[PDB]
Design a protein around this ligand. Structure first.
Ligand SMILES: Nc1nc2c(ncn2[C@@H]2O[C@H](CO)[C@@H](O)[C@H]2O)c(=O)[nH]1
Ligand SMILES: [Cl-]
Ligand SMILES: [Cl-]
Ligand SMILES: [Cl-]
Length: 903
């Protein structure tokens, strides 16, 4: 139709495939696949196959996959190279889908679910599944229904059916406000016991077996928990029924504290959306909790509730179930906006790989390159093992801590992939080495020019300029595909307009939507036929034109990801095409590039500004420099500017018309120094920051590498109505920072940058005065409770015991056998508050489970012995002092000679 695959797996000598057929129905076949590998062969043996080094290869076709494996072992034991794709799944997909795959998302079943498990303490262990599962919400993309399984009787409390009528009402009516677009989509099912529930879920699972299985923390929590819960109740044979092929592998992960389990379900592609989100979204974040990211994207959040989640079922079972339903919806809502599932599908099919393999750049790119080469009848190298040898990364400049009033930043386009292309860095294009000087000698163009014949990197490598590098060529293919699918996206917008504009006064005539290609600008005979169309037709035609512009969108984003994920592969020892010298050629070219243009920008501005030896470039990171514009503004006289936009415009134009062209001369020269294959170092202006004109604000400041704040007015072409605060590494969003302090610090920073020292002082005085009337929870710090027992000594602090752990210990002694409520669980977060001397708790601090109130047993006592002074000093004043000191400011007004006079 054509066929495409859904999932593929290798079990024994058989490939197990789930796929949509010619008729568009989901099917499953088991194919005894017959793999071919390749071996080097003599000058004479002659054929169409050659390895990437141009050495002839003879093909070996095997009886089964097991023999092919034996063969590799054998080849490699002798010492012979064993070439070809040793992951037979990719070879299967490559042979079975030997054409560009087009897929129908709607035929692919995407399950999106969430579990709830009441436990006494709150945070149940998935590998143990000790506690009943008391709510499952499983959204199905095919049905577009939410399947809610609700346990009514449980040792932790017997409750009664959730109310879909209440769920719908507003807060005021004691409603949960489950959105209308959803309410009708909910298929509620309650159960008298857990065994009943699970069995029903398991069977529901066979009837609608997910292809892509997602949700939030589904890999680390939901999936193992459900798996182990069932393994524990019904035994393993039953638990394995969560795999279409009844095959399962339990992998363990290790870290500083515990060991996670991660269940591999053969026949299913798990795309945990938190990982998915982390890896596809181009913005780092302080939290990746569902609620935070939901707030960030949707502006709404997860359902609110009273008390701990560990008590929400007994206390408010209504809210509990509605909250579960919404948690799932939020993930859907985010995906409806961000579209990472489809992006995964698009990428998966493009590379011809298990969809989940979008999490593995080495795997993804290996497939892409393997396929590309296969069609040239080329043979891929055998993967060789290598030591994990660290190597230089990116240049980061040590900023001089200070205020920086006017600032402009420039960065480099797709730096690493650009360098790969410019230098022509591939395993087979390596042509030699040169004797190498220290890096700074190449930076300053003082070292002897490396080569007049080969393309060079400052790490002392040389590459051919004639040949066509496997790698560089392959990432160019992707730069082109991106340009191509933006074409489509635009022609599909200029076509949406042509459609929108005949919709004003169509004909009432009855006709059909035209059969045209929306990727290309409508011809003339279609320009007319479109007028004569009816509303109903034109309306379909637009839905189609828009759907196309969105396929253009997806495709071009997809390419950006591939492009950007390549270098990560190249520096990974497990990559087929890894080579340490190449990884080093790239990163140290980068360092040279940034510092060389750094010097170039400095020379230019000193010159152009009359000065000599001024340091214009104040900071730099990887592929972006930060230039101080103070002397450029003074050179013109600030007095000459009508308003903020006046000076912003001026710098925009100054960067565009003078700096950028100098910058480009600077890079063309570097290209020639290194005799590179082509110039691809393109640096353009990004941000324009500074105080509003005529105000007292400082514009911005740096406390050190990656720690700084700027008041930005322009980001490339786009300019902001109100300036944007660019804050980085100042911990004004870090989880530990008390919520009130987070808002207070951002405000301080804003005032410093936009209004001045006096405004800052006004606020500091303001917040200090207000501090002791705030809710204790908004001013408490947050920490993770790691190694609790390690520092537990008869209930008292051990040696080298962290401050927050001490708080937890103080807390445990105060709640020794009570409600019990609540309990501090290992690995989880806690609020932390200091205590004054001579408190009943017998220590200088106390910590309790975050997101909860302090049990009434001790709350008021705690609040009475809070050390506000220490709290304010450690959490607020300490950080603020760091800022002010760096920016050369006083947050408290200095004594004056006129202090005594009563003006
Ligand atoms: N040309 C080529 N064929 C390969 C490679 N790896 C596996 N093959 C096999 O070659 C056939 C395609 O020519 C398929 O049956 C693959 O199984 C490779 O790296 N290059
Ligand atoms: Cl983003
Ligand atoms: Cl971009
Ligand atoms: Cl704006």
């Amino acid at each position: 139709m054509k066929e495409f695959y859904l999932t593929v797996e290798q079990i024994g000598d058989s490939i197990f495939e789930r796929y949509i057929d010619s008729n568009g129905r989901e099917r499953t076949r088991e194919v005894e696949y017959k793999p071919s590998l390749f071996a080097h062969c003599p000058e004479s043996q002659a054929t169409k196959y050659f390895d990437i080094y141009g050495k002839p290869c003879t093909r070996k076709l095997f009886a089964n996959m097991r023999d092919a494996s034996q063969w590799i072992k054998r080849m490699e034991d002798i010492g012979l190279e064993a070439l070809g794709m040793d992951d037979f799944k990719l070879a299967y997909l490559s042979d079975t889908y030997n054409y560009e795959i087009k897929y129908d998302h709607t035929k692919i079943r995407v399950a999106n679910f969430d579990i709830e498990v009441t436990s006494p303490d709150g945070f149940p262990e998935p590998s143990q599944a000790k506690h009943p599962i008391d709510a499952i919400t499983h959204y199905d993309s095919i049905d577009d229904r939410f399947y809610v399984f609700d346990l009514l009787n449980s040792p932790y409390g017997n409750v009664e059916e959730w109310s879909i009528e209440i769920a719908a009402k507003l807060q005021e009516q004691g409603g949960d406000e489950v959105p209308s677009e959803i309410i009708d989509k909910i298929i509620y099912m309650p159960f008298d016991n857990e065994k009943e529930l699970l069995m029903e879920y398991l069977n529901f699972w066979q009837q609608k077996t997910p292809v892509i299985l997602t949700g939030w923390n589904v890999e680390s929590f939901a999936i193992p928990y459900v798996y182990n819960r069932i393994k524990n109740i019904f035994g393993e044979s039953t638990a394995k029924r969560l795999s279409p092929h009844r095959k399962t592998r339990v992998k363990v992960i290790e870290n500083m504290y515990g060991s996670r389990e991660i269940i591999t379900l053969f026949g299913i592609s798990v795309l945990d959306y938190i990982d998915l989100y982390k890896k596809f979204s181009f913005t780092n974040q302080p939290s990746y909790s569902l609620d935070y990211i939901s707030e960030f994207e949707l502006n709404v959040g997860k359902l609110k509730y009273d008390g701990p989640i560990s008590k929400l079922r007994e206390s408010n079972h209504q809210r509990y179930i509605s909250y579960n339903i919404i948690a799932v919806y939020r993930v859907l809502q985010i995906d409806a906006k961000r579209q990472f599932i489809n992006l995964s599908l698009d990428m998966g099919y493009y590379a011809k790989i298990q969809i989940q393999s979008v999490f593995s750049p080495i795997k993804t790119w290996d497939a892409i390159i393997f396929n590309s080469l296969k069609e040239q009848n080329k043979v891929i190298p055998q993967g060789r093992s290598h030591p994990v040898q660290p190597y230089p990364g990116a240049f980061v400049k040590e900023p001089i801590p200070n205020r920086y009033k006017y600032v402009m930043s420039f960065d480099l386009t797709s730096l690493y992939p650009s360098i790969i292309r410019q230098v022509n860095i591939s395993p087979e294009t390596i042509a030699g080495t040169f004797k190498v000087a220290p890096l700074h000698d190449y930076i300053n163009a003082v070292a002897e020019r490396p080569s007049d014949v080969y393309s060079c990197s400052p790490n002392g490598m040389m590459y051919y300029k004639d040949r066509d590098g496997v790698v560089p060529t392959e990432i160019t293919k992707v730069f082109n595909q991106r340009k191509e699918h933006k074409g489509y996206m635009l022609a599909a917008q200029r076509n949406g307009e042509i459609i929108k504009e005949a919709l004003h006064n169509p004909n009432l005539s009855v006709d059909e939507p035209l059969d045209v290609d929306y990727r290309f600008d409508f011809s003339d005979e279609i320009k007319e036929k479109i007028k004569k169309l009816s509303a109903k037709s034109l309306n379909e035609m637009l839905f189609r034109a828009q759907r196309t512009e969105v396929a253009g969108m997806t495709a071009q984003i997809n390419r950006k990801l591939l492009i950007n994920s390549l270098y990560g592969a190249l520096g990974n020892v497990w990559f087929r095409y890894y080579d340490l010298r190449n990884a080093t050629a790239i990163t140290t070219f980068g360092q040279m590039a940034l510092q060389w243009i750094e010097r170039k920008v400095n020379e230019y501005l000193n010159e152009v500004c009359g000065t000599e030896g001024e340091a214009f470039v104040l900071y730099g990171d990887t592929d972006s420099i930060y230039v101080s514009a103070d002397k450029i503004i003074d050179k013109v006289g600030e007095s000459k500017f009508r308003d903020t936009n006046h000076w912003v415009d001026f710098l925009d134009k100054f960067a565009r018309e003078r700096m950028e062209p100098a910058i480009d001369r600077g890079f063309r020269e570097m290209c020639e120094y290194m005799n590179n294959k082509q110039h691809l170092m393109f640096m353009d202006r990004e941000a324009i920051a500074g105080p509003p004109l005529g105000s007292k604000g400082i514009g911005g400041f740096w406390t050190g590498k990656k720690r700084y704040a700027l008041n930005v007015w322009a980001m490339e072409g786009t300019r902001y109505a109100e300036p944007k605060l660019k804050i980085m590494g100042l911990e004004t969003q870090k989880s530990s920072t008390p919520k009130a302090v987070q808002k207070a610090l951002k405000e301080c920073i804003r005032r410093m940058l936009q209004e001045g020292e006096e405004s800052l002082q006004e606020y500091f005085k303001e917040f200090e005065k207000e501090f002791r009337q705030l809710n204790y929870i908004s001013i408490a710090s947050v920490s993770s409770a790691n190694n609790i027992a390690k520092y537990d000594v008869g209930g008292f602090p051990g040696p080298k015991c962290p401050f927050h752990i001490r708080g937890i210990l103080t807390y445990n002694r105060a709640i020794k056998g009570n409600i019990d409520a609540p309990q501090v669980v290992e690995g989880e977060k806690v609020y932390v508050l200091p205590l004054r001397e001579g408190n009943p708790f017998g220590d200088k601090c106390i910590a309790w489970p975050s997101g909860t109130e302090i049990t009434d047993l001790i709350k008021d006592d705690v609040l009475h012995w809070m050390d506000y002074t220490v709290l304010l000093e450690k959490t607020f004043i300490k950080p603020l002092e760091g800022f002010t000191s760096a920016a050369k400011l006083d947050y408290e007004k200095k004594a004056s000679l006129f202090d005594m006079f009563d003006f």
